[PDB]
Ligand binder design. Structure first.
Ligand SMILES: *[C@@H]1O[C@H](CO)[C@@H](O[C@@H]2O[C@H](CO)[C@@H](O)[C@H](O[C@@H]3O[C@H](CO)[C@@H](O)[C@H](O)[C@@H]3O)[C@H]2NC(C)=O)[C@H](O)[C@H]1NC(C)=O
Ligand SMILES: *[C@@H]1O[C@H](CO)[C@@H](O[C@@H]2O[C@H](CO)[C@@H](O)[C@H](O[C@@H]3O[C@H](CO)[C@@H](O)[C@H](O)[C@@H]3O)[C@H]2NC(C)=O)[C@H](O)[C@H]1NC(C)=O
Ligand SMILES: *[C@@H]1O[C@H](CO)[C@@H](O[C@@H]2O[C@H](CO)[C@@H](O)[C@H](O)[C@H]2NC(C)=O)[C@H](O)[C@H]1NC(C)=O
Ligand SMILES: *[C@@H]1O[C@H](CO)[C@@H](O[C@@H]2O[C@H](CO)[C@@H](O)[C@H](O)[C@H]2NC(C)=O)[C@H](O)[C@H]1NC(C)=O
Ligand code: NAG
Ligand code: NAG
Ligand code: A2G
Ligand code: A2G
Ligand code: CA
Ligand code: CA
Ligand code: CA
Ligand code: CA
Ligand code: CA
Ligand code: CA
Ligand code: CA
Ligand code: CA
Ligand code: CA
Ligand code: CA
Ligand code: CA
Ligand code: CA
Lengths: 493, 156, 493, 156
């Protein structure tokens, strides 16, 4: 904070950083400015004058050697035709703007994209969520818990379960105001696990809406350490650690196809980016690595494999250049790399062994595994860590439940041509059919495996402002509306 | 060959002409999007290929990085190891391959019974509709050796 | 269930168990009844007749040998003057009556003591709690949770704490309707733990009454694995595992005195029985044992030391002959012994490593440690186990929060004569003074250590049927009464 | 000796006569409750000593167990080991005794600083009002070697 301090007079060269050095020291071939900004240009000669219009900007006549010119603030020496200066593209700096950056001549704007109202805040400006405050999804081995970040209160949700694992959700597929979350069940004793799905209300209701669990039928499954839902392609990607493979199936569990089965030691949590048509996953075996590939499964490549411990949680910052973040529970650090793998930088260290991470707004969320705590920090590595809540050591993940985290206006490129599955890929799509089947000879669309009807989900309980759900003789849900509200679902009153 | 209104990709699969230059790689060889003129902008302005936004003739050839790619200044202005035949259970233990889903938990945690639907039974074993592997002598005998009873169903 | 089945005629001797054996087999010196009940008396002779009135009851004339007499049902051969039978004292049988037993001639009554209404139940009769349904106190390392057994719902209680351990409570000391619980804090890093106490409402209020924690000032304390509160003597007994001692102090933490400091490897949870003036504690070190002593500390003795694994939780059945139960987390069994140490019998096995136990009504409660579950079973070893709830692995104890568990009408024998402490003992009391001090010479009451004033507890929040507590300018609590209720504490409306 | 209204126990501590036969062991030798006639019951009935409940003359001498004690039929009818001088920390580690609460955490977890209020400082060390042990040369010097500043307080 400085209006103006320690001004430099005519005798003192102002430099580019306020280095108040005497004029005789300018262009003496010795750097006093600390960045050679006092040796700028260094085109010298006594018979020359500044009036000739040699330099583009800040042309001053030195006492000796003629004219010596510098750059306007926000500009740098061009290293060619040194009497000229070009604009610094400040948008390339990491963490200079919260959401978006536009370049100007020595200036920039921290605009933020649609769906984000600019909100001046403390120690910098951010952009709000333009909707209901985000929720947190906390899976314990027996139950799933919700947490309103702004209201700061829990709510009864899925209970009476066993061995819960990673969580992912699909925002309101039927637009009836109910999103669906997907949770995996570990295999205990001699019984296989499963991938189950259930509804969750986007509104404030809870503790009175009996959630009914339904299995997808994906039998012969042991340890789904990682799961991700492609909302564009309507496919669910999960990685079985014991089966040493990462595979794909439709949202209702049909047409199971193995996607990647080679060179996988222990596939950890995965992620998908339908906008770029790129899937990401982590391996935490004897050779830790972070790999990305197309949703089809082609062009598999390794992003980072150096200075990696136990990469066990990975998430993508969709709204910031599709940047990729991951959590290392062994090195105790959280790092970020661009989706192509360049510009690696650690974001936060001494993270106390983060297990899972999820990015929302200008802040990063991660779980201290052994401490059972959820921690919050600026997602660009600045500031200091903040604690959120303390929960059981059974906690396995933190996941933000909001719609802006998954851009819902990403159109699916599929033209309905595909018979069974239509996987995504950069700039387009592709056809595929279940495992143990092949295309009809001569065609790359039809496959010989017989089609299967989509699975029907039972009706959900929907009492928004209050009331209790109830099962009638045919078990359709019905709400007993509270005071001051009416309707089939107690909406208006 | 196909109709006049269907554009043909290199592999022989031909697609409707409306899908050409539609922004999506419709066919596998992605030739349906190559050889298409990029979107143009009015005179006095240029559009950055990586951004799709028009910028004026002043912003290009300004000796600095105006477009995101910045090519304008030079493109416009110019655990013991198991054997090969040993089946690996979940607990890293190695077991003989004869235990592969004989409908009885051998590896523990029913690892041997895992997903033997895609894999095929060996010639010495009979494959029934559940995918479980049973000896060929245990088919068409009046007793359901397979728990799905497909052994007694695939009989004359 | 039998009105009468397989009746025995005159020729068939009915026996004491329905052994329909022929009359010629009676008193043939070979047991056909299975208990020699067919050889009863065996006073034989043909010239003798039953009319002589030789036997007291059931005198019958055998076809040969004269008269042969048996015992009335509910009576046994006396083994002396065999023609006579005495009454079986059925009250000595374990688990024959739920709460109390009175003996009669071949009969008994399962009466239950004051404060227990007889309630016929399924598979046997029990006696109710004559009050609000019992609560459960579940200490997690960060928070304490409550659970209404009948309402089956949680309630917000003490939170924002660290390293909680064993729990004990004192029922409504001031009779203002607020009981006080005592919780110990483990020592973390290089900071000592403490013994803190706080209020808890006996009524249904919760989630809106800010509970204020206060430390007792018992500094220099590391690991209080066990704690018990003597409601009669107004003293608190705790056992420090690291300090290898079990000591006593008054309820407000004054006049600390070491009680037992010798031959203690790892003192586990303890218990006190003011009615008998006997303290009980368990050692889970290299030599497991269950020891009892007077509250004074004299007459220390070992109750059981054989077939013991890790005795880590102990509780006393006050209402049933002051019987003692304990939980063994290594042998995986829960056993019961009389307070003098005879009649040892395992109650339930395959208990899945119980950690703490607490007895209430006709049922026994224990915590499956690694499973984090609370389990319920008949306290007399019959029936089959029942599960209650599933909670975090941070669970450390289950404790029933009810007044009938601690008989409040046990008068303190102390005559206020004692200067600092008045410990209890069988049939009376005793005098003592803090550690590092001794009695004034010639007297066994006064001690030289200067007295200290009792500690003042801050006022609590009291809003029964509803409302929110609030702190005024002098921080006195005040409730904002809900609709349809009025009063300073919203009692009547 | 004491007043006529005070009953004397064997140790010399004499107690008021009202406390005699009051049901509580008032004095240590408990002689204030011995030599007192047990509570009696009306004729034709007997009171079990262990129960305090009267039962009739018919119930006694009935050749069975009427009272809880049942005496009526025969009483009425008739990790390396540390040295001796080594201080034990909480972590079983043995340390020299010079570390006992020198106000600096030596054993870890401040085990050496535990409860040195009842124990007395050794002659070579000065004891201040917090109970912490400091060398005798660190008393009355103008600086608070004890954190409670009692070293500079107990001075002439
Ligand atoms: C979620 O993804 C959608 C695309 O599926 C994004 O919508 C696009 O956002 C850009 C931002 O500037 C708009 O220009 C797009 O509008 C259209 O753009 C095309 C050129 O590509 C023009 O020819 C059209 O005339 C029009 O201006 C817009 N496209 C659509 C289909 O809405 C959206 O920004 C993104 N949202 C988030 C929060 O990431
Ligand atoms: C909690 O302890 C109290 C004693 O502190 C128990 O109260 C006593 O219970 C017995 C049960 O039958 C009663 O007789 C007692 O009444 C009195 O008993 C004496 C003889 O000891 C007589 O002389 C008196 O006339 C009177 O009948 C009763 N004593 C008191 C002081 O109430 C109580 O049962 C017990 N409660 C529970 C639930 O354990
Ligand atoms: C999470 O908490 C916020 C408040 O911090 C809730 O937002 C308000 O919800 C009420 C519900 O009736 C609305 O009437 C208000 O208009 C909302 N205020 C704002 C700031 O939008 C939000 O609904 C809560 N969400 C859940 C699911 O609990
Ligand atoms: C525990 O639950 C029981 C109900 O199962 C509660 O008992 C009732 O409480 C209400 C409170 O207004 C009383 O009006 C009823 O008369 C009670 N019924 C019975 C059977 O007594 C009990 O209050 C609950 N206790 C707590 C602390 O939650
Ligand atoms: C020269 O630099 C000054 C700041 O020192 C600035 O105000 C002025 O606009 C500049 N002029 C030119 C021509 O660069
Ligand atoms: C003899 O036994 C019968 C039951 O078999 C019983 O009903 C009867 O009262 C008994 N009589 C005597 C005198 O014991
Ligand atoms: C079917 O395929 C499996 C997996 O490759 C085995 O090779 C098996 O032997 C095959 N069965 C036959 C009959 O060839
Ligand atoms: C005080 O007592 C402790 C503990 O017994 C030590 O013996 C110490 O040496 C004593 N101090 C003195 C001065 O004798
Ligand atoms: Ca210089
Ligand atoms: Ca700029
Ligand atoms: Ca196309
Ligand atoms: Ca340019
Ligand atoms: Ca098998
Ligand atoms: Ca067969
Ligand atoms: Ca016989
Ligand atoms: Ca009887
Ligand atoms: Ca007395
Ligand atoms: Ca008798
Ligand atoms: Ca020390
Ligand atoms: Ca000093």
């Amino acid at each position: 904070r400085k209006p103006t301090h320690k001004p430099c007079t005519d005798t003192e060269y102002k430099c580019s950083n306020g280095n108040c050095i005497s004029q005789h020291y300018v262009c003496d071939n010795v750097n006093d400015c600390g960045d050679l900004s006092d040796e700028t240009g260094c085109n010298l000669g006594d018979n020359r004058t500044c009036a000739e219009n040699i330099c583009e900007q800040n042309c001053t006549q030195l006492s000796s050697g003629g004219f010596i010119c510098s750059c306007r603030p926000g500009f740098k020496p061009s290293t060619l035709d040194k009497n000229s200066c070009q604009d610094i593209n400040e948008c390339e700096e990491f963490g200079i703007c919260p959401q978006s950056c536009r370049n100007s001549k020595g200036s920039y704007e921290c605009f933020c994209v649609d769906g984000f109202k600019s909100m001046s805040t403390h120690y910098g400006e951010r952009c709000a969520a333009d909707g209901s405050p985000p929720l947190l999804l906390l899976p314990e081995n027996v139950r799933i818990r919700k947490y309103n970040t702004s209201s700061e209160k829990f709510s009864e949700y899925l209970e009476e379960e066993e061995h819960i694992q990673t969580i992912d959700y699909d925002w309101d597929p039927e637009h009836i105001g109910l999103s669906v979350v997907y949770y995996t069940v570990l295999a205990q004793g001699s019984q296989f696990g499963a991938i189950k799905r259930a509804y969750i209300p986007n509104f404030e209701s809870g503790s009175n809406n009996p959630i009914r669990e339904v299995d997808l039928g994906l039998k012969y499954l042991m340890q789904p350490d990682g799961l991700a839902v492609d909302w564009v392609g309507r496919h669910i990607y999960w990685s079985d650690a014991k089966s040493q493979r990462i595979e794909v199936a439709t949202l209702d569990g049909r047409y199971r196809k193995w996607l990647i089965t080679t060179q996988l030691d222990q596939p950890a949590a995965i992620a998908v980016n339908p906008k770029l048509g790129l899937m990401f996953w982590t391996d935490q075996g004897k050779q830790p690595k972070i790999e990305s590939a197309w949703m089809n499964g082609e062009h598999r490549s390794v992003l980072v494999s150096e200075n990696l411990g136990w990469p066990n949680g990975l998430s993508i910052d969709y709204l910031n250049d599709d940047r990729v973040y991951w959590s290392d529970s062994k090195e105790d650090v959280i790092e970020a790399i661009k989706y192509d793998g360049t510009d690696r930088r650690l974001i936060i260290n001494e993270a106390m062994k983060p297990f899972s991470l999820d990015i929302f707004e200008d802040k990063l969320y991660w779980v201290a595994k052994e401490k059972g705590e959820v921690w919050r920090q600026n997602k660009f590595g600045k500031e200091n860590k903040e604690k959120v809540l303390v929960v059981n050591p059974w906690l396995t993940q933190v996941r933000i439940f909001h719609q802006l985290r998954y851009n819902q206006s990403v159109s699916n490129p599929c033209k309905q041509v595909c018979s069974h599955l239509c996987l995504l890929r950069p700039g387009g799509y592709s056809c595929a059919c279940p495992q143990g089947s092949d295309f009809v000879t001569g065609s790359t669309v039809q496959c010989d495996a017989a089609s299967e009807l989509p699975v029907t989900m039972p009706p959900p309980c929907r009492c928004m402002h209050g009331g209790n759900c109830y099962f009638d003789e045919n078990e359709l849900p019905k709400c007993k509306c509270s005071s001051g509200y009416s309707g089939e679902y107690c909406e208006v009153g």
